[PDB]
């Protein structure tokens, strides 16, 4: 078994995590319980005694499209005191292509973790408990003897393992896109969808020579990633109401997008007119419209991704299943502003659907950007924090706030 | 004894080393005391003599000290705790009543001198040393060091946990019929098993930790129901709060009024309809403990309900996994909500309450789905498991309210329960613009050294007013200006504003709220039949912005 341990080094002055354990039911303690005293005998982790002060949450997933229990380890805070180690020493590079592919193909590779093994030193960050029930057991306390799921420093000592499982695989398709981001590999080409789909099948078996398997994606296409232009209305008679609600949403546009102007129709606007009341559009001003409608649909224009700063995004509940976002790095200065739609069964399920377009967002950054956004999510932080894994299936947890959707703000991205 | 059991690697915060505290000296009588103390101790295997090469040392003290006349021995391990490592808190809530599982048979086992029984750390004993001083600090002090848990020390409580942890293991595991709650130095026993198997099945429990260096008490010294445990009264078959007793003072103190505050959440727990809001509202000093504070009328009406509530015993049941459990909410004022969970048709394992987001601008409809919320943390803690939710609101209200509101908002399972107060929204702002409405074009603002702000309206029919105000902000005075719509509009109106602050505060429903300002709107939105509010950026063309 002995293959050297990495030292990893925790960062300079920082300590380890010490995060409080949230409440679980006890279908996901019971199911814990089991996936832990398995790993155990594997050798995968081991028990701890107070000794231990550090501690992440824990928490029970349930396998995305293979539903049957899985563990889910938040190391989002162990992760940040671990940041020099793997975002700057053993940093995993962004291909720039990825976000081009006609498809795109998520595999998970943590099972991969499990084999190589964790710095004695450095074992201590990665304890968890596993709590009971109105306290009568304490927790079951572990710790980790095998590089964790969900720690990305894992990733970055892997690496090398990594490159040498794919150096054939690699080889022989030159132009397949590999990228891998956590516990998944982000398999992409321009190959018709029944070859991508072969390409991946092999990629597969090579992958399983290595302890790899599971007897594909999310299947995403980033190539038909379009916009959402701001959005104007089409003329015909337009009320002082609707003046005054297309200078609304042209204003703040205005300050996002350059060429804009709302000059010609604010003007219209300089009464005490009863709003009902309709009023027609001087050309001039169906000539500042239709200029603006233009730029709607065309890329901010001065606006980069800083590599340095983080990504921010909100999420605006737009009723009828609908939710809109926006992925910037500096209010307003937007980088990627999709939307995400209801797909019914759970058809009235609000957090149900934040959840997924938490995800469909969180993998569109890791393909555009190789990097998750920080969320400010519309919603309760309490009712988050209860059922945010009742529908959770992605490996990895991005970085939330709770915030207060500006009443207009839900508006103009109104699609 | 002192258990067999490992010891656990003790070790200190990082970049430090053993306290070196110097010994104030002590009285030839406490002297002698601790000598006597530190004999027996000795002797026991609890402390041991030291060479005057080990340069730690931590102050020893000796108190009687009234109706005593047998002191005991005090260490100020106040700087060894400086720097002691941290431990791991592994006791993150302590069992609630209402989660004992409803055993047959039940044994409680109180551990005789928890901390001296268990090992401490070889290389650790070394940081641990006192020194009983000679009369004058003349000679040299008697030096010792701990081989066992100090009482007063920092990783003592977490120590004597995995040590019992451990201990109890494989018990438990050939055992798990059996539920050991382990609670401090305690340990409670119970299992449906009865006194056959049952005071039986305890005395191997027992002989397990003897094997291992723990005492207990015998069917004669194990105590017997109920027992008055951590300001509870539990019987085998029910709970309650311990014996509440309301104060029969007249003058109410600030201290008095907080205790009763706190008795009064205490006995909150079980005695359904307990509130406490009105005498709540006096606690808002000032300060002084001592300060006699004069009693509103609403208070004296509160507290009488509360002597009512508690006039006679109310009881709560255990619990039975096997039975969903359900929470039923109830309206008891304003920002005023009460709920209780049973498993069956009014027995109730448990009892509470909820009061306001400090309720600033907000409705029902928000107010129940925070208790609702509430209660689901709860029953995960306490049951690990959510309820089933009866609510005096009806689905169609729930629905229009939260299919349109931009939060996510998320109750799981629910059914009406026609018990007034139902709960309901005030009324609601329209979609559309009120065709033959008079559209008052409300504005208001403010100087900020001045302080002093205008507050007006111009409408579609010509009208106008300019309501001049004083120590007044932005915010009061785009909301003084609705309020000036709303006053001269009449029954139908429309109202452009350029506040996305009101805006905001009045598209959400409030039907309570903090500001008399925001209560005034609250008052008239009421009254009026249709009312379309919007919006428009200032200083831009908008004629009436
Ligand atoms: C162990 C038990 N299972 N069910 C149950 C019902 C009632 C009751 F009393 C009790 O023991 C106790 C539990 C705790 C706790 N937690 C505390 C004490 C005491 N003293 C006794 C139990």
Redesign the interface.
């Given at each position: 078994s002995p293959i050297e341990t990495v030292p990893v080094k925790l960062k300079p002055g920082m300590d380890g995590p010490?995060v409080?354990?949230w409440?679980?039911?006890?279908?996901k303690?019971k199911a814990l319980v089991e996936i832990c005293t398995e790993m155990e005998k594997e050798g995968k982790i081991s028990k701890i005694?107070?000794?231990?002060?550090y501690?992440t949450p824990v928490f029970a997933i349930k396998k995305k499209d293979s539903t049957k229990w899985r563990k889910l380890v938040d190391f989002r805070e162990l992760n940040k005191r671990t940041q020099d180690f793997w975002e700057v020493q053993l940093g995993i590079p962004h291909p720039a292509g990825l976000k081009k592919k006609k498809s795109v193909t998520v595999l998970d590779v943590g099972d991969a973790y499990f084999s190589v093994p964790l710095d004695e030193d450095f074992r201590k960050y990665t304890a968890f408990?596993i709590?009971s029930?109105?306290?009568?057991?304490?927790?079951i306390?572990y710790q980790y003897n095998v590089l964790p799921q969900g720690w990305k420093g894992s990733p970055a000592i892997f690496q090398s393992s990594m490159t040498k499982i794919l150096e054939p695989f690699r080889k022989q398709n030159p132009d397949i896109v590999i990228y891998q981001y956590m516990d998944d590999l982000y398999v992409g080409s321009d190959l018709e969808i029944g070859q991508h789909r072969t390409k991946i099948e092999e990629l597969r078996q090579h992958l399983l020579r290595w302890g790899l398997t599971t007897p594909m994606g999310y299947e995403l296409h980033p190539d038909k990633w379009t916009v959402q232009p701001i959005v104007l209305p089409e003329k015909d008679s337009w009320?002082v109401?609707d003046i005054?609600?297309l200078?609304?949403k042209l204003?703040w546009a205005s300050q996002i997008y350059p060429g804009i102007k709302?000059?010609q129709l604010?003007?219209?606007?300089?009464?005490?007119?009863?709003?009902?009341?309709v009023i027609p559009l001087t050309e001039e001003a169906e000539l500042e419209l239709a200029e603006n409608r233009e730029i709607l649909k065309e890329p901010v224009h001065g606006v980069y991704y800083d590599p340095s700063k983080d990504l921010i995004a909100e999420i605006?509940?737009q009723?009828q299943g609908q939710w809109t976002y926006q992925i910037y790095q500096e209010p307003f200065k937007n980088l990627k502003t999709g939307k995400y739609a209801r797909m019914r069964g759970a058809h009235?399920?609000?957090?149900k659907?934040?959840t997924e377009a938490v995800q469909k967002i969180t993998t569109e950054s890791i393909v555009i950007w190789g990097k998750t956004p920080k969320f400010k999510?519309?919603?309760?932080k309490?009712?988050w924090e209860?059922?945010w894994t009742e529908y959770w299936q992605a490996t990895w947890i991005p970085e939330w706030e709770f915030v207060?959707?500006?009443?207009?703000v839900?508006l103009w991205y109104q699609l």
């Open positions: 010490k409080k354990q409440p679980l039911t006890e279908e303690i005694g107070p000794e231990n002060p501690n408990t709590p029930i109105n306290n009568e057991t304490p927790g306390r009320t109401n005054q609600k200078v609304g204003n709302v000059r604010c003007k219209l606007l300089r009464g005490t007119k009863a709003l009902t009341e605006q509940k009723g009235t399920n609000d957090v659907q934040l999510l519309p919603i309760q309490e009712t209860t059922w207060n959707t500006p009443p207009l839900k």
